C-alpha cells in the first residue's frame, strides 16, 4: 500500500501547506498547488496544498501542527493521502471564534483577522477544522461550523463570510500552531542533525528502542560560547517533536533563601514526570555546580548532591530527557560525567561564513532591504560574530535608517504610517556604519572551518601535490582498501623550505580538497603556553581537534620553541620540555583509526630535536622549493584577480626577471602598484578640485578620471622597489640538508634476483 | 548521620549481611581537602560506627573508591578497611566475555567474529561496550528505516520479526567511540612469542637463565643460598627491537608486563614526582610477578646536556626516587626491572651498582638468518600472494635494523594501493565513457604484491644506523670485558 | 533583597524610568572576592530581577563603576549590561569648560587668565577643580 505517509515535523508554518518529495509526486501524479485529502485517526479528514521540498524523505510527510490537531493525530503516526480533484469553489463559509481566544477584544474580527488571512490565499477548508490567525498580540482560533458546498470548499473572492454570534467553547484539544520551528535555527546544520538523530527516536516511538533493548540517552550537554542560542534550539526541538519543555533557570535556584531552593528542584523533576515525554532544560549549569575549588560554603555542595541524587533517581521511570548548557567542558564539577549522568556532549561552535548568511536572512524578514544591499558581502566581511551580535547590528542599522528620516514620518507621532516607515529601505551605507560601531564578542577564540583556498592559487608543485594526495585523500575516501591490505597510514608530515613560499596555502588547499575541518596553531600562542600554563591548553586543543574529525591540524613554526631554547636565556627549557613532552605523549595516545592528521612546518629543520623524527610521530619530510615561472604567474594572477586590471603588461617577462623571488615578495610587488595608482588617482582628484575652486563649475561634465587599471608605467614604478627576500646561502643549506638525507637511500639498483 | 546509624542498626538486626558504600570519596575525602565541619563530623561518625563492629553480628562492609589516594588515611588502620582488591580494566578475553554477555537479546547475523572486534577496542570498559552495542543496534534501525509502516501497539514484535546487525554497524560504532580509559596504565600478559623475533640465542639463554629459572624452581635457589639479580640493562643501536625481547620473555615467563615510556618520565619531573613513582611501583609490586620495563632511560641526561641547565634538579629528583625505591625491594615478590638505552656512556654511575641494575647486555643488529626471521614475522599480512625467496633479501640488507625492514615492507603496500586505486579509477572512467560495457562484474586486480613492487619499493633503502656507532658499542663492551 | 526588589516594581508601576545603581562593584565584585555567602545570593537576585524585564518594559537600567574588570563576568552577557561607555578624564579644553560652569556664580576680576589655569592643571578631575 504505497499511498500512506508517516507524519514528521515540518518547516513551513502556513496552515495549509504540506511538503512532499519529488518521487512521491511522480508516483502519485500530483501537481503543485492542488488539493489533497489527508486522513488520520478518529475518522477525521483534512485538505492540504501540495508544496515541493527536497529536504523531506520519500517515506516521510512534512505537515504542520494545525492540521495535526485537526486530524486528531500525533507525530510518528501514519496518514492516508489521496488526490482531491473534485474540489469546487465555495459559496459561503460560516466561521466562529473560540470562547477562550477572544477574551477582551471588542472589535471587528472580520476586518482584522478574517480578511487578511483569506486574502489571495485560496485555502481549501472543511467543516469542523480549526485554523489559527495571528493578530496584534494573541492568536485567534476559528472553527468552520457551516460551509457551502460541504464538506470541501475553496475560498474565493465571491464568498460571503459571517463572523457574528456567540463564540463557541474550547475544543479540548488546544488546536494550536505557534512558537519557533526549524526555520529559526541557522548555522548549526551538523549539530541540529546530530541532536535530531538521538532525541527524536526515543520520544517519537517510546517502544521501538525497548524492542531492541537500546538505552536512550539520559543527558545531553550542549556547550559553546554564550549567546549562540542554545535555549532556542532546545525550545524548537521540544515544540516540534512534542513535549512538555520546562525551563528552570540557574540564578532562580540560587536567589531563594537556602532550604526551599532544594525543594524547588525536587518539585520540578516530579512536575516533569506526570506530563509524559518531557525535556527539562537546566540553563547556566556552571552557576549551580561549579568547579569544586570555587565552592567555599555548604549550601552549594548540598545543591550539587541533591541534583546528583535526583539525576540518578531518573532511572527508567518516564521518557524524560535532561539537556544542560554550559560554556566550556571544564567549568562544571568533574563528577557530572559518570555513566548514567551526562555522557553525551555537543559542541555548538561559532557560525562561520555561509551559516551567518541565513542568520541575517532570518532577521531581515519584515524589514524591506534595498536592492543595493548585498547580504553575501556583509556576511563575508563580518567574522567573529554570534547570533546576538548580528541581531544587534541589524537592529541598530534599522534605528539609524529610521533616525535619518525623522521629519518625513511626522516626527511627533500621529499613528505612524506603515507605508512611510516601510519605505525606509536600509542602505549599504547604513550597514557599513553599523559595522564600524560594533564590537564583536568571539575575537580571541579558536575557529574550526572549511577553508576555501583552491589548488590553482598556487602553481601546484605536482610532485608535492601527488605526495600529499597519497598521504591524505586515499585514507578517508577508500579506507576499505587499507583495511583489506592492513597498512597503517602515516600520521605526520613535516615541511621545510625557504621562509614564506606556500606552506599555509598548501595546507589550506589540501584541507579544502579533502573537505575536512582545519585548525590553525601559530607560534605566538605556543610561546604563550611556554610562559606559564603548558599542560591543559594542548590537551583541550587536541580534544577539540579529535571531536571534529576528520580534520587537518596545523602547527605553524614548530621550530620557534627551539629558538627560545637556544639563546641567552637558559631558563625556559623546562617549559619547552613540558610542551614537547605533552605534544609527543598526546600524539602517542592518538588511535590510528581516528582520522586526525598533523602537519607541522619549520623554517630551520636541523635545530629541532630529533626525538620527534621517529616512527609514530612526524615521519615524512617534504622540501618545498621556491616558486618558478608557472607558480609565479599563478600567484600574480591570483593577486591581481582581486579587483584591478593590468591589460598592458607581460607577466611571463616579469617572471623571467624575477628568478629567485619568493611568493611574498611577488605579492608585495603586486601591492605596490596599487598604492601608486591610489596616489595618482587622489592627486588627480585634488588637482580637479583645486581648479574647480579657481573657476566655479570648471568641469561641469564629469569626464573619465583615472578608472581602475594598473598601467605599465605604474608597474615599472612599483617594480623598481623590489627585494631579493632570500639569499642564496639559505638555499645552499636547504639543498645540502636535503642531499644529506637523500644519500641514505642510495643503492646500486637490482637485477631480479633468482626468480 | 542518623540515616547511617539507622542503616547499620538495621543491618545488625537481619542476620549476616553485606553493607555496600558507593562513592566513599564523596563522604570521606582527605582531611585537608575538607573545609567546613559537617564533613569532619560525618567522617568521625563513620569511624566510630566502624569501630563499633566488635563481634555484634557477622557483618562485612565493602566500599568502592576510584583512586587509592583520595581516601582519608584514617580509614586504613587495622580493624577498619584493611584488605584492598583492584578491579582493573578487562583484557581481550574479558572484553570478549562482556560482548558475549551484552549481545544476548540482540539477534545477530551469521557474519560476526567478535575476536577482532574485541581486539580493536583497546581501552574500553563495560559501559562503553554496552553503549557501542546500543549504537550498532541504532544503526541497524536507521538503515532499516521506518518506510511507511504501521508499528502501532504492536511495534516490538513487528520490528523484532526480522532484524540483524552486520559488520558496517559495528565499524560505525567503533568510529563513534570515545574511550574513557586512554590516559591509564595497562597491565596484562603480552602476546609476542619467541617466533616473532629472530635468532639471538645467547640473549635468549641469558634472559631465561635470569628470569625463568628463579620463578619455576625457587626451592633450589633457596637451598643453595641464592639472591637472584634484580635488574638487567639492555644497550645497543636504536631500532633493534628491545621491547620485543622484553615482551617475549614476559610471555614465556607468564608474568605481567608493565611499560613506562620516556615522555611520561620527563613529564613526571615537573609537578607530581613522588606520587606517580610511588603508585606505579606499588601497583607493580601488588601484581607480582611482573617484568617492569623502562624505556629511554638515558633521556634524563639528554635533557641535562644543553644550554638550559635547569631541569637537572628535577631529573636528579626522579632518579633519586627511583633509586630509593629499588633499594626498598624485597625477595618476597618476583619483581623484575629492565632498563633500555642507546647511549650508555652518559648513564650516571650510581645506577650501575650492586643490588641495582648491574648486568649489561649488548643487543647486536639482526644479521643474515635474523633478518630472514624478522622478515618472516613481517611476512604474514593478509595479502602475501605467493612471494619469492628472502635469503638474498637478508644478504643485501647488511647493517639494517628492524625499523628499516618494516619501512621497506610498508612501502610496497603503498605502491600496490596506488596501482589498485589508479586502475579502479581508470575502469570507472571507461565505464562512464562506454555504458553497459561492464555489465558482468569482472574481477578486480588481485593483491598482486609482485616482485616489481618490492624491487621499486626497496630502491629507497635507508641506512638508518651509521657505522661509527658499532665501534663505540664494541669499545664499551671491551671496557666491560676485563 | 527586599529593598532592591521593591525598588524594581516601584519603578515598574510609575512611568518610563531610569534606575541608577551607584557603586555596582560594591555589591557585585569579582568571584574570588566573594568570600561570604550573602553576596552570592544578592548577585543572583540582581541577575534574576534584571532578566525579569520581559519585552513590555519602559525601564532603562544604568550603572556606574570603575575599570570594567571588577564587575563579575556573568553581568556582561547578552540581555544584561551590554553597552559600555568610557567617561575619560577631561582634556585642557574640557577643564576650561569645567572652570567656566564652576565660575558662573562667582564674581571674577579683570586679571583672570582661565586659559592659563586650564593649561596648567594637567591631571585633574571635576571635583578637584571645584575644590
Ligand atoms: N537562527 C539562529 N541561529 C543562532 N542563533 C540565533 C538564531 N536566531 C536567534 N538567535 C539568537 O539567540 C539568542 C537567544 O538565545 P539565548 O536565550 O541567548 O540562548 P543562550 O542563553 O543559550 O545563548 C538571540 O539573542 C538571538 O540573537
Numbering used by the authors:
A (entry chain F): 22 to 776
B (entry chain D): 283 to 764
C (entry chain E): 283 to 413
The authors write:
Endoplasmic reticulum–associated degradation (ERAD) maintains protein homeostasis by retrieving misfolded proteins from the endoplasmic reticulum (ER) lumen into the cytosol for degradation. Transitional ER adenosine triphosphatase (ATPase) (VCP/p97 in vertebrates and Cdc48 in yeast) was identified as the primary energy supplier for ERAD and has been shown to power the defolding of ubiquitinated proteins via its interactions with the heterodimer Ufd1-Npl4 (11–14) and the deglycosylation through its interaction with N-glycanase 1 (15, 16).
Hence, for the subsequent EM analysis in this study, we used the constructs of Derlin-1Δ215–239 and p97Δ1–20, herein referred to as DerΔ-p97Δ. The DerΔ-p97Δ heterodecameric complex consists of six p97 molecules and four Derlin-1 molecules, with a molecular weight above 0.6 MDa. This misalignment between the Derlin-1 tetramer and the p97 hexamer results in an approximately 15 to 20 Å translation and an approximately 20° tilting between their central axes. The tilting angle between the central axes of Derlin-1 and p97 causes two of the Derlin-1 protomers (Derlin-1α/β) to incline toward the p97 hexamer, thus lifting the other two Derlin-1 protomers (Derlin-1γ/δ) away from the p97 hexamer. In response, the four p97 NTDs bound with the Derlin-1 tetramer adopt different conformations to accommodate the tilted Derlin-1 tetramer, with the NTDs of p97A/B in the down position as in conformation I and the NTDs of p97C/D lifted to an up position to match the long distance between p97 and Derlin-1γ/δ, with the NTD of p97C at a “higher” position and p97D at a slightly “lower” position than the NTDs of p97 in conformation III. Despite the atypical geometry of the DerΔ-p97Δ complex, these two channels are connected to a large cavity between Derlin-1 and p97 (D-P cavity) to form a long, continuous ERAD substrate pathway extending from the ER lumen to the opening at the C-terminal surface of p97. Additionally, the binding pockets of the remaining ATPase catalytic centers (all D2 domains and the D1 domains of p97C/D) were largely empty, with only some discontinuous residual densities.
